[PDB]
Amino acid sequence: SSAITALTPNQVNDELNKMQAFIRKEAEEKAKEIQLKADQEYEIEKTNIVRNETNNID
Amino acid sequence: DLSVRSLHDIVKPEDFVLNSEHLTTVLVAVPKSLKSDFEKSYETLSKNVVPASASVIAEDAEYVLFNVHLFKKNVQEFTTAAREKKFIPREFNYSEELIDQLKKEHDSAASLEQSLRVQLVRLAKTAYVDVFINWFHIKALRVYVESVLRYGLPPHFNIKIIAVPPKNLSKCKSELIDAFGFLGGNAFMYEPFVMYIINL
Amino acid sequence: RLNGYLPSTKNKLLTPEMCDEIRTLMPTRIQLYTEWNLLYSLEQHGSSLHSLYSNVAPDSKEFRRVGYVLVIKDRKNGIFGAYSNEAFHPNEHRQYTGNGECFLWKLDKRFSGYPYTGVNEFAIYCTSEFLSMGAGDGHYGLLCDDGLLHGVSNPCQTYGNEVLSKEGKKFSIVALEVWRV
Amino acid sequence: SQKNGIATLLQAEKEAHEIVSKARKYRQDKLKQAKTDAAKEIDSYKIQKDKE
Structure with missing residues (x-):
């Protein structure tokens, strides 16, 4: 019948949506972790370099 | 399938x-x-x-x-x-070429089943020559040593080959031992004197 | 019905046509398996006889039925050599170590040969100072110096061979190769 | 048919590539910004010390 489907034709799209949803969720999680590490570096190496500079110049 | x-x-x-x-x-x-x-x-x-x-x-x-x-x-x-x-x-898999390699392997099999057969023929015939030569050499040494052991000092042995084609090998053996058993000794008529077989 | 080689990017090697031609004359069961090996050379192994003997280790355990081929080019491109079944290495003076089936030859683009004869077994010899082939009355059939610089070749009873070198009585060496089969 | 569900998966992969690019670029920009911030802070400290 050109469509060998045992269920309704839209549960395919519902599972499609869930699939792209978890893809987006994992992408967001990794992006947020990258942002967090970029924030913490912002402070830690800034502090290290300013400290050692300030000390030697003092 | x-x-x-x-x-x-x-x-x-x-x-x-x-x-x-x-x-x-x-x-x-x-x-x-x-x-x-x-x-x-x-x-x-x-x-x-x-x-x-x-x-x-x-x-x-x-x-x-x-x-x-x-x-x-x-x-x-x-x-x-x-x-x-x-x-x-x-x-199956996404080889994109397996079709041609598999047929080439079949063709290589077809070529080798020809080539190796001829090479085996040649090596086997040369072996059947040289190994057989060594086989007769070994039996020659065998007869020499047996004659040396059983007989005395000088070599004057009459080494002969007699071929009995029709179903008469054991009969020839009996004819030789009974008519010439004394050659090895009265009480030593195991075979009386030196004699060996070649089951060709 | 074909032969292979194993050199390494040097100026002069041996030709495949020459090996095909020589393949005609040697004991059977040897011509069958045809993969020649360059055991030693003059260009990429120095010019020392001791180096030659060290390189040619009498390693016959894998195959004691192995043919040893020595090819030498004389002063004026006259190629020739001999075939041996035993590895070369200095020995005690007791006896010549050699099977009565070796032969000599004068090759060219014109092959010839001189199979071993049963007259005697002479000058199949090997020592730290020279390496000569069949001899008898007069100097040896083949000869190479300790230094691989001059050589001598003359007829001998062991082979009845002719004079191989272009400079018959004595000559000089310009390139040498050795092959194992 | 199955192609109907492959375009959306390709788009999801494309936005995954875009967001990884964004995350790495933001990380690098934060590194540069932190370096610049430290540079200006040490500039302020140095001007203070040399004026003293």
Whole structure:
């Protein structure tokens, strides 16, 4: 019948949506972790370099 | 059968899912009677299996080749469930060339079954020559040493070969031993004197 | 019905036509398996006889039925040599170590040969100072110096061979190769 | 048919590539910004010390 489907034709799209949803969720999680590490570096190496500079110049 | 054998010229890339990390497609073979049952049961063998994916790829006199689009992980689960379900999924890969290499391997087999046969012929004949020469040399040394042991000081032995073609080897042996057993001694008529056989 | 080689990017090697031609004359069971090996050479192994003897280790355990071929080019491109079945290595003066089936030859683009004869077994010899082939009255059939610089060749009873070198009585060496089969 | 569900998966992969690019670019920009911030802070400290 050109469509060998045992269920309704839209549960395919519902599972499609869930699939792209978890893809987006994992992408967001990794992006947020990258942002967090970029924030913490912002402070830690800034502090290290300013400290050692300030000390030697003092 | 087409499904069990190589599908090098049968299945095409469109039947597969390419350049997508999380998605793939397997090749499935359906027996004659289990078309509808599998078609209504192929999605239930693993999770994250793209439903509404059944499609005919090929068929033989006892099976109909289908395919299922599903995740990379689910391939193993679907295959094992099918195998336990008396269901055979097909085997193939995206080689894009296996067709020509396999036939070239067959042609190499056809060439070697000719070449190696002739080389074996030649080595076997030269062996049958030289080994046989060594065999007669060994028997010559055997007769010499036996004559030395049984007989006395000087070599004046009459080493002869007598061939008895028709079914008369044992009879010739009896004729020689009974008529010449004394050669080895009265009480030493094991054989009386030196004599050896060649079962050619 | 074909032969292979194993050299390494040097100026002069041996030709395949020459090996095909020589393949005609040698004991059977040897012509059958045809993969020649360059055991030693003059260009990429120095010019020392001691180096030659060290390179040619009498490693016959894998195959004691192995043919040893020595090919030498004289001063004026006159190619020739001999075939031996035993590895060369200095020995005690007791006896010549050699099977009565070796032969000599004068090759060219014009092959010839001189199979071993049963008259005697002479000058199949090997020592730290020279390496000569069949001899008898008069100097040896073949000879190479300790230094691989001059050589001598003359007729001998062991082979009844002719004079191989372009400079018959004595000559000089310009390139040498050795092959194992 | 199955192609209907492959376009969306390709788009999801494309936005995954875009967001990884964004995350790495933001990380690098944060590195550069932190370096510049430290540079200006040490500039302020140095001007203070040398004026003293």
